[PDB]
Design a protein around this ligand. Structure first.
Ligand SMILES: *[C@@H]1O[C@H](CO)[C@@H](O[C@@H]2O[C@H](CO)[C@@H](O)[C@H](O)[C@H]2NC(C)=O)[C@H](O)[C@H]1NC(C)=O
Ligand SMILES: *[C@@H]1O[C@H](CO)[C@@H](O)[C@H](O)[C@H]1NC(C)=O
Ligand SMILES: *[C@@H]1O[C@H](CO)[C@@H](O)[C@H](O)[C@H]1NC(C)=O
Ligand SMILES: *[C@@H]1O[C@H](CO)[C@@H](O)[C@H](O)[C@H]1NC(C)=O
Ligand SMILES: *[C@@H]1O[C@H](CO)[C@@H](O)[C@H](O)[C@H]1NC(C)=O
Ligand SMILES: *[C@@H]1O[C@H](CO)[C@@H](O)[C@H](O)[C@H]1NC(C)=O
Ligand SMILES: *[C@@H]1O[C@H](CO)[C@@H](O)[C@H](O)[C@H]1NC(C)=O
Lengths: 50, 591, 50, 587
């Protein structure tokens, strides 16, 4: 679900897309976070900003 | 937790990983072509195999989200792009042999040479035939290639056809030709579905509509080549194949120097102006940038200028260099060129930059749908940039073409003839080749008869007769890179029809009058916005609809082809009223 | 498009009902204005009013 | 780029141009029928050709917007209304011959006579009981007209069938059913064969009591003609007082149930009141407004001419309702102070009132749901005005007038001679025409099948069967010309179904001819809303809404005549009941 104002959710629990109970990663089980790829050659909308 | 919601989660993850993994592959490929090293080969191989394994695994996972249960449509289409089994159904020994035979056919084509009266066919022998004035050398070259290389490709070509058909059955198609036709199918639309059979029928009906220009153009070409070699070529008979100057039969550019309407009339060539004006090659690229801004399309990113490598690597980096546009992912757009201060490089620069205008607009869509509406749109739109680059209005306004230039109808005819001979002369060739490949994959024609059928199709469809009879051992179509390799030729025909339909659609938005070759798209910001409205859609929307919003038709029409060459068609008719029109398929140097 | 409060429009630009430009009238080229035709015998909702 | 959007823009344009040209045509035609002169003929023909030319161009353009891509059923139906090619599909030489034939057939109809044809031939038969005089007039006219009518009728039928085939119909009879079947809608579709069978089944369900009327009338003819009428076989057609066979009404003076019971009437009150044409219509308006039907506006009253203007500006004295469009509604009639004119004023007012209601819709839908509803609504208000309770309510019927059942029986018999006697004949004629257009009967057998089916369906036959040389059916005005007779039979039932719903709204217990459906404002307002539907909502739903069924309803007709059928049952015990086809007056 969506976060509340100023809420900081730092959970690392694996999210399961389906009904089947899932532990760890799997076919329909994914880590909530994804990394950004920052490289000096990426375009303006993909570059990192502080 | 139903199929649509899980499919949405799955594809979003796939698009993130796909951007990073393809990017690693695209970087390795760029860096390799820029600088040829052992390390760059390992980067290409590692990124390629990891990305491919990634795609195979995600396709397998895609199979657990049935297409028929999804009501979202956008993810449905993304899954349709991902769901095709490819090699996963085909038996392991057939898959291994199919990859081995494709690599072998490519290797033989690119390494097999034709020993001089030894030389590689592409580009060496083709260049000699194109520049040579002795038809006996071209005839020898065709026979020598069949004797030296055709015998190496034939038995493998036959096995290749069978192995591709087996894959096509594994993918639930009648043959591999049908598999290629399937690239043009859509579904889930309001009466926009085209079938594979309809694609073939549309091509044949379009050719029946095209034919008057092809026949008047051909009668002119055939008679001029006859006058060039009157002791060999019949005034009634069709032209011999070796005379084309292109071992493949695709490019009729090598006949132009013999068919020039007037020896004294020039073609437009602004190379001398750029040299006299001391313009840099990167300036003609910057002028093309100015053109794109003027049309009304997005401006080019700074990342392009910094990441692109437009000049020839020379002798500093070991390199492979040719014009090509790259989309590396995540906003990284660049062009690789061997740029020269010449008109040919200018039109190429417009072609390749236009390809980046499209990749920049395609970036609005998810990675898996980050492509054009169909296979032939990319080159067709680059050709749209090329056609506006070629017209004298464009060149004169920039200053590449002299400020005192005035139109000379005979010069326009010389330009139009060269262009029609290249662009139109190839059309019935491309068609008979696609159709031959289709019948070959279908299996309707026995393997031995295939060579007959090719010879008969050349004679019946384009007025080209092989000067030397050949047996089953030799294979004529295999002389083209794309026949020995895995390539669908329907897209060249389709690209060109898209190209002329686009020139008309943008001419109408531009509100220009006169012959369609006279009509430009420079400035004309209505045409810019009209074009921008499809560029942003790419592969995500039905290609038939994606073109429909611009061209205003359920299918493509020939009419812009005749409009482009209207002064040429009229001129050709005026000369053809006296010359013989048509060709005899009974005449043959063999006979 | 529809008019804004107190907006007046005196254009007679021909509307093209398809995806192509059109010069003059035609099968799907519609002139935006129509004339009136008033006769003394018309009904209350059809007679002219000032 | 969407077919529906382009179709809507097209139809809006169409409706404006169509309304202006419609007015021009209807006004020029009004002026001619109102004032007979060459100048109005010139305007009539020029405006009519202009309007038709407009429609053919609009049909050509309508065909460019396929019906299956339209999501708005109103738009889809309007396109369907224009896409039909009609007369434009038939080849030019076939069309030239077809039009020549129609004009020749009309000319022949008017050219022939009983050795002038109109109205004298029916006056001769209707006003004389001499068996031989009616027989002579019958044979004398058909012997002059049918010889020239047959070849042209047969060619007309073949050319119209070719037209229908070109329009994707099996034959022209099927074409007509195509015009009567509902289209432009989804899930209410009916088959043309089903419309045909539904009418045939309805006929067979009503027939068993019609045989009781037929036995009664045959016995009365026996009393008039003891030596010529068989109690078992078919009755002579010339004794009906109608050369065409359409009506049995001129037998009424012979068949009156109770001679001592005069029919209920108020004519004496209109004569003492001296109601003029405009007051007859305005009093009818008072009735119509109280019913709940829309009021007739001042424009109609000043523009209409309900009187005979005289010889200086002679009018065509055929009561008709005219819809000119753009609010211009008129009735042309030559009203006299009679009961037939009182009821006629109600028929044409209701007819134009239908036109008034449909004018609110788009032009293509400014047509009625069914041709039979305009006449049915008129007939309903006519019947309601005819009802003794109405005549008592208005106050024209004497304050001390007392109704009874036997007077109503005399009324019902006149109504039965008009409806019961005509329905099997008109039904038979429509089926006969269907067989000639369908091509079931060889041309040389068209009259033989007529004779055979006339014996089985109608029970009244030609006194002498005609020769194959002559086409007696084509001597009838509506047979010679392009006309479907399904609308007359079905219009009767349309009237009875509507009458049933109006009677139920009145909530009177008794026979349908007794219940007073005057006032009952809600019932008239509901009928008005049904009128407003025009072609926008199919006629089949209007009928379903009144009786609760897609099928035609047998019950209200038989319930209307039930006291009469009871009388007939009491007379049928003595008469032979049923028609034999073995005996005819000739044999
Ligand atoms: C598109 O429009 C621009 C102006 O917005 C044109 O640019 C001018 O071209 C003429 C050519 O002789 C020059 O003299 C002007 O100085 C240019 N103006 C500017 C501001 O650079 C351009 O030529 C137009 N395109 C074409 C093909 O005519
Ligand atoms: C091939 O694709 C179909 C979906 O069309 C899928 O059901 C089947 O399992 C796939 N087979 C393999 C081997 O991936
Ligand atoms: C487009 O980009 C070039 C990059 O050098 C810049 O000079 C030019 O002003 C830009 N034009 C617009 C309209 O942003
Ligand atoms: C080519 O790549 C290799 C390996 O990265 C590098 O050592 C070499 O200097 C490169 N060549 C040039 C000319 O930069
Ligand atoms: C070019 O124009 C001249 C007239 O100025 C005409 O004689 C000539 O035939 C034309 N050539 C073409 C190819 O139209
Ligand atoms: C009626 O007809 C006469 C013909 O003599 C004509 O003069 C007169 O103007 C007509 N009146 C109308 C109202 O059409
Ligand atoms: C009319 O009603 C009276 C009531 O007594 C009855 O005797 C008579 O038979 C009825 N007549 C008919 C025709 O029903």
């Amino acid at each position: 679900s969506k976060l509340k104002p100023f809420e900081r959710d730092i959970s690392t629990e694996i999210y399961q897309a389906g009904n089947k109970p899932c532990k760890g990663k799997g076919p329909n089980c994914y880590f909530p976070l994804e990394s950004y790829g920052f490289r000096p050659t990426y375009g303006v909308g993909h570059q990192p900003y502080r | 937790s139903t199929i649509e919601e899980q499919a949405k989660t799955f594809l979003d993850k796939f698009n993130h990983e796909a951007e990073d993994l393809f990017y690693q592959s695209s970087l390795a490929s760029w860096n390799y072509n820029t600088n040829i090293t052992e390390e760059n080969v390992q980067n290409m191989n590692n990124a390629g195999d990891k990305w491919s394994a990634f795609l195979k695994e995600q396709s397998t996972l895609a199979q657990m989200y049935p297409l028929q249960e999804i009501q979202n449509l956008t993810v449905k289409l993304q899954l349709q792009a991902l769901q095709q089994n490819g090699s996963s159904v085909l038996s392991e020994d057939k898959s291994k042999r199919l990859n081995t035979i494709l690599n072998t056919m490519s290797t033989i084509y690119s390494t097999g040479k034709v020993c001089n009266p030894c030389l590689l066919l592409e580009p060496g022998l083709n260049e000699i035939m194109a520049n040579s004035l002795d038809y006996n050398e071209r005839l020898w070259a065709w026979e020598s290639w069949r004797s030296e290389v055709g015998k190496q490709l034939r038995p493998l070509y036959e096995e290749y056809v069978v192995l591709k058909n087996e894959m096509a059955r594994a993918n639930h198609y009648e043959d591999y030709g049908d598999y290629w036709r399937g690239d043009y199918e859509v579904n889930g639309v309001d009466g926009y579905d085209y079938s594979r059979g309809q694609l073939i029928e549309d091509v044949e009906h379009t050719f029946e509509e095209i034919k008057p220009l092809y026949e008047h153009l051909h009668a002119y070409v055939r008679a001029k080549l006859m006058n060039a070699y009157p002791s060999y070529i019949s005034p009634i008979g069709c032209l011999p194949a070796h005379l084309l100057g292109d071992m493949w039969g695709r490019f009729w550019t090598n006949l132009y120097s013999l068919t020039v309407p007037f020896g004294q009339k020039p073609n437009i060539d602004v190379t001398d102006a750029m040299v006299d004006q001391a313009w840099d090659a990167q300036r003609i690229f910057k002028e093309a940038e100015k053109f794109f801004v003027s049309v009304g399309l997005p401006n080019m990113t700074q990342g392009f200028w910094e990441n692109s490598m437009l000049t020839d690597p020379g002798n500093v980096q070991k390199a492979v260099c040719h014009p090509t546009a790259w989309d590396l992912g995540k906003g990284d757009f660049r062009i690789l060129m061997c740029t020269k201060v010449t008109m040919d490089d200018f039109l190429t620069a417009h072609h390749e930059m236009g390809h980046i205008q499209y990749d920049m607009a395609y970036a609005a869509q998810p990675f898996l749908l980050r492509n054009g509406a169909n296979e032939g749109f990319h080159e067709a739109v680059g050709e749209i940039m090329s056609l506006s680059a070629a017209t004298p209005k464009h060149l004169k306004s920039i200053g590449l073409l002299s400020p005192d230039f005035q139109e000379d109808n005979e010069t326009e005819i010389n330009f139009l003839l060269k262009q029609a001979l290249t662009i139109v002369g190839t059309l019935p060739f491309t068609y008979m080749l696609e159709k031959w490949r289709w019948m070959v994959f279908k299996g309707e024609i026995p393997k031995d008869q295939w060579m007959k059928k090719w010879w008969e199709m050349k004679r019946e469809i384009v007025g080209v007769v092989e000067p030397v009879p050949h047996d089953e051992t030799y294979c004529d179509p295999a002389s083209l890179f794309h026949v020995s390799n895995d390539y669908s030729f329907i897209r060249y025909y389709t690209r060109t029809l898209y190209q002329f339909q686009f020139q008309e659609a943008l001419c109408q938005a531009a509100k220009h009058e006169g012959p369609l070759h006279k009509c430009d798209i420079s400035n004309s910001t209505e045409a810019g916005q009209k074009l921008f409205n499809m560029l942003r859609l790419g592969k995500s929307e039905p290609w038939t609809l994606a073109l429909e919003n611009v061209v205003g038709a359920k299918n493509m029409n020939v009419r812009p082809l005749l409009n482009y060459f209207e002064p040429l068609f009229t001129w050709l008719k005026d000369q053809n009223k006296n010359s013989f029109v048509g060709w005899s398929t009974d005449w043959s140097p063999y006979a």
